[PDB]
Amino acid sequence: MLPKELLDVRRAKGRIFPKFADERDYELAEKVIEIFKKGLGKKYGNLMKQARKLENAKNFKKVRGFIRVLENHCIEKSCAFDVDSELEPRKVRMLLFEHGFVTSKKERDRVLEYVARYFSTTPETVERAMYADREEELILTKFRPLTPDNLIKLYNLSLLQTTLFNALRLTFWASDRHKEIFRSIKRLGLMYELYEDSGRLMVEVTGAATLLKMTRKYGVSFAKLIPWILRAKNWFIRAEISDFDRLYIMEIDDRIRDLFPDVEERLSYDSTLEEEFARKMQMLGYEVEREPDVVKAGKYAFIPDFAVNLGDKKVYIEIAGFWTDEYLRKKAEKIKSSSIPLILIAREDFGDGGANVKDVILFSRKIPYGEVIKALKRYKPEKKVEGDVVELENFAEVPSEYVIAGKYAVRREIFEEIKREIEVSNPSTLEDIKAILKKYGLGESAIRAFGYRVRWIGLGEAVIERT
Amino acid sequence: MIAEIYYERGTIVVKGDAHVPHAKFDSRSGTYRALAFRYRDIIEYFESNGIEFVDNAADPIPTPYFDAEISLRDYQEKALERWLVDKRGCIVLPTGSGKTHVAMAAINELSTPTLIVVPTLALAEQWKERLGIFGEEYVGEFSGRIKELKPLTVSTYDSAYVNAEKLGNRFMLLIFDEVHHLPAESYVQIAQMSIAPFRLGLTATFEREDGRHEILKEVVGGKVFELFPDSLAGKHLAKYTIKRIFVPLAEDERVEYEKREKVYKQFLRARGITLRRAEDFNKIVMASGYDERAYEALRAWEEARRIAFNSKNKIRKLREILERHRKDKIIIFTRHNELVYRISKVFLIPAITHRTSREEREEILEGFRTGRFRAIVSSQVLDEGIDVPDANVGVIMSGSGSAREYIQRLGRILRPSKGKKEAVLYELISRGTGEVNTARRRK
Ligand SMILES: [Cl-]
Ligand SMILES: [Cl-]
């Protein structure tokens, strides 16, 4: 949220620690809030200007970071503005832009006088109205008060999460709130790998943030995970950030919980990227029983998203969004090693196209609910070791269905030889095809495949006898 | 009582400082001297460690400001960028007009006295014909046939070698065509004896030829970009060229810039730091902290960069480009929102910033998709998320490689116009104010 240029960090030998703000900084934060409070009716750019005159050599990194964060909050959440014009700026500018583009003062005046005539006004009023709904030209009407502790805590949260936006990968641990933090990971859909290592009963989680493709898209959802993390009672976070020749490492702790705002579960204005788990659990509900609300893991830890109920065992499925070739190969070798079902379906139209997986891969498109359904229908429940069904197969147990047939199966080559022998020998009788076929593997109910149907052409029907 | 360097017979002799690098004391002379090609390292020493000095070594041939708009292919532009990092090093290219063009663009950009050096007098005539684009007034040849000292002089290794002394201190840019000829013990004296800070070698060979590629890095610099014909014959040639325009600062703008320029530059060399990229000054001033005048430095630098990007001249140059393309579709791109809105106000072009709503964003792009708006100015459209409608012409106000990849992305969406062969991606680069040199009336 806070720009990487205006980043106030201490540069250590091999570490990096964000110089957070605290109650030592109350007095300032109050001063920058007061001129927004006292400057209602003032052009929002002029308040921005005043707030930045409070800038000097010692405070500039944070008095600027304050103005930025308050600005965002005021704009996005806690303020209401008036446009200082009688004209709607979108209307003015679209009529202007619809009259071509101008490359001279003369034709520029022509279109202005043309638009001014339309809006029953002067050209200067049209030139003012054009971008009058720009933040800095807006008139501040309602600023709701912020307590300077609030602003400081926000500054620390954005300053924390903008450092993390620039990092390559980060690993943390949380005491409480595993499930909803997990659910936040999945809807955000960043590539993960959870490990029960360097600890006991402690799930350690890792995730990358500095990618080659779509680096900002998931760079901006990566920092959207951190308030859920900071929402537990205890957490130990370390990250690996680098843009130099070498890397720096930071580590923040739950003892800094007093520096960041309290944020209960927001959970608003979305389907939570669970399009399939919410609508196509119903498409799969017609075929088998399913449970989108799943929590599972094996010897190592993998986050499922859906579950397929088979009687012998269940099939886990994961529907994460983000992916990369090098980043998928690690998560993929684990699913086969532990022999866990772990059905995986990615977005082949959103990420970059590299080399699809040899054994287990799923592609996606505009409507890919089938492209992965082709590989997924092959749940393959314990299909690696299969015995011979030629004989045995509970023969002692029950021969109730053991009346089908008697002996071995024919070979395609031999089958092709008998077919070739049958196409040319010219049979027309049952007693004529029976002898040609009895020479090699006799059997009556064995003209199943030769295209012949035996037919009693006489008067009446075919009799039977007891054996 | 002041340090001074002067030029003599292919060497620089320095008087007034003894820590000057690569200098060696000639007991016969009583003064320190080094090979003339140590010019940079010596000039760098005096300005990094703040020793004021006189320069009686350099006597450049007066050279204008070249604003030829040399059209480059994408990978040729890529080649130019990688060279300009050091402005000293070597390139290999598949074709030979590609080599020249890159050399042609670099000469255009640097606008200093330039000496091309080729093996044969046939090539010498081909270079100097190609260099006609900058005006034959400024092209010349210095070989056996004729000896004339123009801003763009072409010569052969053979005649340059015989004349390494008289040619040492008179050009700022040094171009070697088929550069692998240079490592002969005679031809290296050409390089070793000219003060020319900027050095470009053009070739197509490999890095395993008798181990003499070792002496190149010392005297011209090592490879910065490689592309052999086989990597060209496997990919389709993109349908657009990337021309570079050089826009001077106006006089008053150059007045104020040099002010703020002096304060930040004086503070940085007072520190004596070597900044890799100017963006690291946004961050070096924060992490180091513990400094009162570093704010005043940042404030001047920030003030300086702002004077440079809002150049009144760059919008006038954009005005000229727009008249030139009244019939085509155009996407202008900078990274500065104030400039995006300024371009929009001046030329009545739809703007798309990150503060633009998804409604008006999609309106603009659909109206650019149809014929409703012939142009867009924007700082977002080159993002990986949204797909831009096709266009015939791109402009990059920024010109710089802060975000180099944008030049690639802006090319991706360009397509030739009905009636023309290929598209164009201008890029506007802020260079000088005037007053480069004299009229070459000496001798
Ligand atoms: Cl000597
Ligand atoms: Cl002189």
Author numbering:
A (entry chain B): 1 to 467
B (entry chain A): 3 to 445
Question: Can you list sentences taken from the study reporting this PDB entry?
Answer:
Xeroderma pigmentosum type B (XPB) gene encodes a superfamily 2 (SF2) DNA helicase conserved from archaea to human (1–8).
The crystal structure was determined to 3.0 Å resolution by molecular replacement combined with anomalous data obtained from an isomorphous crystal of AfXPB complexed with a Se-Met derivative AfBax1. The two AfBax1 molecules interact with each other through the C-termini, particularly, the β-strand loop β-strand (βLβ) C-terminal tails forming two pairs of anti-paralleled β-strands. The two AfXPB molecules remain the open conformation observed in the AfXPB crystal structure. The AfXPB–Bax1 complex structure reveals that AfBax1 exclusively interacts with the C-terminal half XPB including the ThM and HD2. The crystal structure of the AfXPB–Bax1 complex reveals that AfBax1 consists of four domains: the N-terminal domain (NTD), a central domain (CRD), the nuclease (NUS) domain and the C-terminal domain (CTD). Interestingly, the inhibitory effect of AfBax1 on the XPB ATPase activity is removed by Y-shaped or bubbled DNA substrates, which allow the AfXPB–Bax1 complex to have higher ATPase activity than AfXPB alone, suggesting these NER intermediate DNA substrates activate the AfXPB–Bax1 complex, in agreement with its role in nucleotide excision repair.
